[PDB]
């Protein structure tokens, strides 16, 4: 692979240096194959970010009792974000089953923007 | 930026295609950035990822009650993240404060490896 | 703007249930907190008891869990049943919607009209 | 059952008047008080929340201080509509507790 991006590179344009070239095209490559791992496993659902709390009554909280998951059900992933207030009660927001991460970031945006 | 990147990539292997390979390396440098720009956000602990449940009892799991925040508090970020099954009580284990997504990915990559 | 208006007896018998029921108007009665609480005339305010559509509900210890309150979500209707009435019941009872603010509050913004039930 | 003390039981205060009402709770509620303004006859008006924090709509010439476990309500300029009966609410701990009321007067 390192090889390709190299060639593609040269052809573009137009012995130590070429094993360097050759790390750092590798190195590139892992953190982008990184990048797109972590954008699969964000599809999946698999990376549980909480999203944040709405400043208006919305659907979507409610106490943690929402939070119901299966009496058979072992999943390691926690079904909601809850913030407890001393003020008040319990309030959940379910995490998003897919891009979670990237609503979130959208959220943040929206919200510091 | 992309102007010294290339004149690197020049001296270490040593008119369209200057703009392309100049436009390439501004969209790495912009990538490399973002991902920068993330692990920034982990380190503060604005992202808020989700810990997995614990499959023992540990002093960081508790009822949503343990998730006490100020009154005055106005934070749009969930304290904890929680699961209520439906065969007993709710769960709550507490977001971590800094690198909440890198302690998540160790947690993942602990438990599926 | 969420507006709520008691209805039910003025007139419930000693040793017999209160049944009261609270309509919710321009709003959902889901997704919120909703408490009853009572003033006895001329005496101060009673907290009963709180209840959200979505989960448990919370009564106030002084009324000796004789105290029953649910949510009937396809009527947008909020019910108390305060069971083996005396004549320290009659007040002025109100359903009032908890505040929120980034959170369930256990505050009440906005609140019925109130309606006077006698115990006699 | 946090008891929720009020002082005084009654305020004889005017028009333009630098008026205080003095809440106190049994235990600290973390400034998770509430102050309330009932008119006779109608259902309480929630003014401010966690002790500081005025309602939107509210004139701003509500404030709430927050002195250690001694929360006080106070009116800048008692206007003619702001002579009614003020609660206070504790939040922090159930069963939520009212105030005894201190009814403003002429």
């Known amino acids: 692979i390192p090889q390709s991006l190299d060639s593609w590179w040269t052809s573009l344009n137009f012995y130590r240096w070429m094993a360097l070239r050759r790390f750092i095209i590798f190195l590139f490559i892992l953190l982008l194959a990184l990048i797109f791992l972590l954008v699969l496993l964000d599809y999946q659902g698999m990376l549980p970010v909480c999203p944040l709390i709405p400043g208006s009554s919305t659907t979507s909280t409610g106490p943690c009792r929402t939070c119901m998951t299966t009496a058979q059900g072992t999943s390691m992933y926690p079904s909601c974000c809850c913030t407890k207030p001393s003020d008040g009660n319990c309030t959940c927001i379910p995490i998003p089953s897919s891009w979670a991460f990237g609503k979130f970031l959208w959220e943040w945006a929206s919200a510091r923007f | 930026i992309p102007q010294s990147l290339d004149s690197w990539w020049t001296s270490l292997n040593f008119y369209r295609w200057m703009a392309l390979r100049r436009f390439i390396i501004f969209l790495f440098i912009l990538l490399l950035a973002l991902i920068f720009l993330l692990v920034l956000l982990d380190y503060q602990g604005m992202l808020p990822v989700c810990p997995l449940i614990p499959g023992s009892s540990t002093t960081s799991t508790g009822p949503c009650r343990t998730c006490m925040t100020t009154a005055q508090g106005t934070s749009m970020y969930p304290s904890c993240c929680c699961t209520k099954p439906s065969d007993g009580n709710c769960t709550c284990i507490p977001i971590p404060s800094s690198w909440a997504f890198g302690k998540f990915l160790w947690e993942w990559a602990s438990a599926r490896f | 703007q969420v507006q709520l208006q008691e209805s039910g007896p003025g007139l419930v018998r000693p040793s017999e249930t209160l049944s009261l029921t609270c309509t919710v108007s321009?709003?959902?009665?889901?997704?919120?907190?909703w408490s009853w609480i009572r003033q006895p005339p001329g005496k101060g305010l009673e907290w009963i008891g709180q209840?959200?559509?979505?989960?448990?509900?919370n009564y106030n210890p002084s009324l000796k869990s004789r105290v029953t309150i649910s949510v009937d979500t396809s009527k947008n209707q909020l019910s108390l049943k305060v069971r083996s009435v005396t004549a320290a019941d009659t007040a002025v009872y109100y359903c009032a919607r908890h505040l929120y603010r980034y959170g369930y509050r256990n505050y009440f913004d906005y609140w019925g009209q109130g309606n006077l039930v006698t115990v006699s | 059952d946090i008891q929720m003390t009020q002082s005084p039981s009654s305020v004889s205060a005017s028009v333009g008047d630098r008026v205080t009402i003095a809440c106190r709770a049994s235990?600290?509620?973390?400034?998770?008080l509430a102050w309330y303004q009932q008119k006779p006859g109608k259902a309480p008006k929630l003014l401010i929340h966690?002790?500081?924090s005025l309602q939107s709509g509210v004139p701003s010439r509500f404030s709430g201080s927050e002195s250690g476990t001694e929360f006080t309500l106070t009116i800048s300029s008692l206007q003619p509509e702001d002579f009614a009966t003020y609660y206070c609410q504790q939040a922090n701990s159930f069963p939520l507790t009212f105030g005894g009321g201190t009814k403003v007067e002429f």
């Open positions: 235990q600290g509620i973390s400034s998770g």
């Open positions: 209840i959200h559509s979505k989960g448990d509900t």
């Open positions: 966690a002790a500081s």
């Open positions: 321009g709003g959902s009665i889901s997704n919120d907190y």
